[PDB]
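Key idea: predict the complex, not the pieces.
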Amino acid sequence: DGVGQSSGNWHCDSVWMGDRVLTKSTRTWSLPTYNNHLYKQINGSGTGDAVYFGYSTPWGYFDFNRFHCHFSPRDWQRLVNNHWGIRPRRLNFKLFNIQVKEVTTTDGTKTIANNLTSTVQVFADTEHQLPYILGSAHEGCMPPFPADVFMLPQYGYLTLNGPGSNNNNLSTPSSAFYCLEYFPSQMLRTGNNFVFTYEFEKVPFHSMFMHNQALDRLMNPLVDQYLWYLDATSGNNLTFRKAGAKNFPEYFRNWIPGPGCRNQQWNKVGTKNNPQTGTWASANKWRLQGRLNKYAPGQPNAPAEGFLTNAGDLAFANAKATGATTAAGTVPADILLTSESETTTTNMMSNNGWGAIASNNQNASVAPTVQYEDSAHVLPGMVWQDRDIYLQGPIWAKIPETDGHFHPSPLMGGFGLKNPPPQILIKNTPVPADPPTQFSSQKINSFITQYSTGQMTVEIEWELRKENSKRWNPEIQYTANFNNSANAQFSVNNNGLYIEDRTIGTRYLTHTL
Amino acid sequence: DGVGQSSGNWHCDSVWMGDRVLTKSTRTWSLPTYNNHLYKQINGSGTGDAVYFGYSTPWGYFDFNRFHCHFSPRDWQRLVNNHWGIRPRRLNFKLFNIQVKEV
Amino acid sequence: DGVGQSSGNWHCDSVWMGDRVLTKSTRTWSLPTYNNHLYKQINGSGTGDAVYFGYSTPWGYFDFNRFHCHFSPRDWQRLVNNHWGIRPRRLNFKLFNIQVKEV
Amino acid sequence: DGVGQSSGNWHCDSVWMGDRVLTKSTRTWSLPTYNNHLYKQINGSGTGDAVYFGYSTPWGYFDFNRFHCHFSPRDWQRLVNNHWGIRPRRLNFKLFNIQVKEVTTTDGTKTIANNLTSTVQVFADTEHQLPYILGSAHEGCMPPFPADVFMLPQYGYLTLNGPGSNNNNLSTPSSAFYCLEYFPSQMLRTGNNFVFTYEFEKVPFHSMFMHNQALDRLMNPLVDQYLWYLDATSGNNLTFRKAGAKNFPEYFRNWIPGPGCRNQQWNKVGTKNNPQTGTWASANKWRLQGRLNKYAPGQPNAPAEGFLTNAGDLAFANAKATGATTAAGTVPADILLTSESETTTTNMMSNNGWGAIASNNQNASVAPTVQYEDSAHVLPGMVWQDRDIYLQGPIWAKIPETDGHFHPSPLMGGFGLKNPPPQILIKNTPVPADPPTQFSSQKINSFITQYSTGQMTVEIEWELRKENSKRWNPEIQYTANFNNSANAQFSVNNNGLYIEDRTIGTRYLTHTL
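Result:
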């Protein structure tokens, strides 16, 4: 307590026990004053597929939601080679060592001093009464590398909009406005700190395993089935073949591949692709309220070998990539692609539809015909694999509250949660400048420029499924690149910039289907 | 207590119970020095319907007396549609996190 | 009990408590003799999208299934402005003051 | 219990104890089916001072509110000669011996049978959640004479109306519709009966006394006052007279007469009155929502001797008077006038205004002038007598619920009550006629014609103020008319019709002011 005593210690490490496992991380953050201490309306213009109505807020927030915040590339390797599953259990969050500083500008020379009596105010929203913007995969998370310092993102949300005149951006009567000072919050000077705990509800483990067998291939090859079918109508009579004799396509099966839809496929070799100035009209789209949104990412369908889809699968970038775009003759060295190909056993590939069905009735005169089905939705007796969790990808998402939802696993991958971890919101308390001597009822426009900084820490408790497999031969495992290099993998370069070489999927160890 | 520890927390909300109801609000204020540390006589001029004699004081005051201080437009809606009457009972006032600055 | 004493009272009202809520309703009904004391087969004719086979019965039935039976337009207003959800819990049914008349 | 046993006994009598007093009465009533088992809207036409919007209801009600229900002319005499005050305390109400009968009409010959299984249903409204029509001095009360049989009045109320087009009779959005089957009520066959009890809140006694002194006359005539006033300005100097020397108008006083307003006065001798085809334009009126209502009755102001006012004071009629009008060269023999003349001591007479006040400033040149005040409202130091309760008049009224009210004594006289006795409402339960064999979802139009009858009883407990007065000489008292007559007073005539000779005020015994 007091000005001269620290309110916490630095905890970053990983504790590997048999069943649970406990990861600790702590980072240094910097919080400005957004919107100059004001709420503001924000809206679009004209009628179009992108139109919005919402509010911007003078509040920041802590987003730890991404995986590589909590795990190092070694721990991640250590995780995914030895284990069939993981799910979260508890988390513990703490802020401490708050310090607030004021910025005085004389000419072009800034003078930054240390204001001891200023406060910051923070609250966690445990009832989910605010609009929930986490799990939408925005920026502003902890950095991957513990030694970086980051700036907290601004909070904002956008509500219903409605049509009028030529502008769809008008506010509908039910557009909601939330004031965040109408929430009880804890005001912190430099001495005092902040903590709370949270506990996840039980969710199914994420499967870390790649299947050992295809669906159509589940059987004994050595013995034929006892089931009979109609092979041939020739000769004015019916002929029943018996399923067997190593002819697989004719076998009866209890299970059928998962749902999906056909998606446009772009070859990774740029000379083989049609020269489109941009890919929109070719995208898979779903429409809502009379405006079209790209469908991304789709169902976990893998593409053909050597091909990809736009937004159909996740992609990341290095820290060397800046700006909104990158280009190269092949996939750029900065962009990090992901692959769902481990799912092709159960799931459906994107380069063709789901199958074929009968197109007509027949008679002696007319021949039978079939048609192809490019899209397949859910049926009874249908199995599939959900999208994989990566090291750079999101962890959870909030299941929206609706009368119904089906298999609520987030399409970007993760753990769907009814009651996700609470949003944590923080603000610099406004300090007004010298008021005039005569009284005025108007708002106080002029304040003192100031910001704040301090450490945070996050402690997650993960539960993991131990792996017992009696297969004789060795398995694929994650291994650091086998090559010599000018820069080591997942390490800092000469200039001091941390660089992630790959997105590391969780699926290596095989498991019987 | 001390320079480096806050003396209070931010409380603004509304608690709706069956019979009582409890509204909390908190705001940030700024106090100058009025009359340069002096009491002063103030008075009008001439004979007219507006004439006065009084004093101006180097003191400020907190006026919460108006309704919409305590209620949000949603709580007010929630109040007036469901109910035939309201009267006050108790109030609780607090100041904290005082900081004084020189110019 | 007996010819000259009523077997029940008229209950129609609505009781609004904090969590549960209890609605009462009572009505007067008239029951004829259907099918002149007979079961009867009923069926359609020809091949078509509307064709049927079934039986008609000399029995009546009480259908309260619709909402506005139980709620008045004021209670319904009072319900839907203040609340995010409703589900049923219990029901209680009673017949009384039976009287049979010959023509 | 059962068909063959009575559910009650006949109780009518009066029990005179020292302090409380207890009056019992019971009557026989007949209840039809109003509106053929239907609620109905009722409304006026056009724009005018009389316009309405409301509903008529298939329910009857018991109104005992009038005095002479509970008291006989002998008990009333016995009451008002011996006592200075009375107020109610408790009441007890009971229904019993219900019997319901059906009416079959074949040709022009009615056949009335006795339906044993039919029910009536009754409830008392103790929360005053219905529109309260008692205390508006309608008909349909118990008869004055215990042996008469009466028919219960129909229940109905009328709500807000509002303007549109040329019709002010449209329903405003807030016009309320009350369904009386939405109240729990007790269903009664012939065997079972009904009872409930009620207790009045404490109200001030009604003063049964006429004052012994005028206001201006309260003093000692034998000694002059010590107070001095300016009598005369003559002779360029001020002259102060002393109050006394048997000159009363100059005395100082602590109290001043009650409020009132000037009212038009019509001489009881028809030849002396201006020939108006009707009295409206001459009436005292107050206006509400842009429509004019006669002001009746006004403040308890007495008129000149030999004069009266329209509606300024209460008036009644015999049972010989039928139809809506009666006429005679003088006040008709049927009409029963009331007189407030006992109040002229404290109150104000209606034949002139309240007084005079100074109309101008003065100087040596200009003379002083005054003007007359025809209307006086309430001031500090103002005393008055409330209107008297008669034998034929109402007992109580319901104080409307408002943010403010002043001296809530009803202007027709009575006891103003916050929580008056509950309205009692009764209906014949509908019995449908033979339904068709095929099903129809429309309402059941045809019912069985039936009505019902049975005894009721009412028991009031009155508290009365004993009289102690040391005056030496005898007092005015009520006395039966001293004359021989063809028919005795308050008695039945040859044809069997009960006739009330007078309205008997409560004020005889004197009391010092």
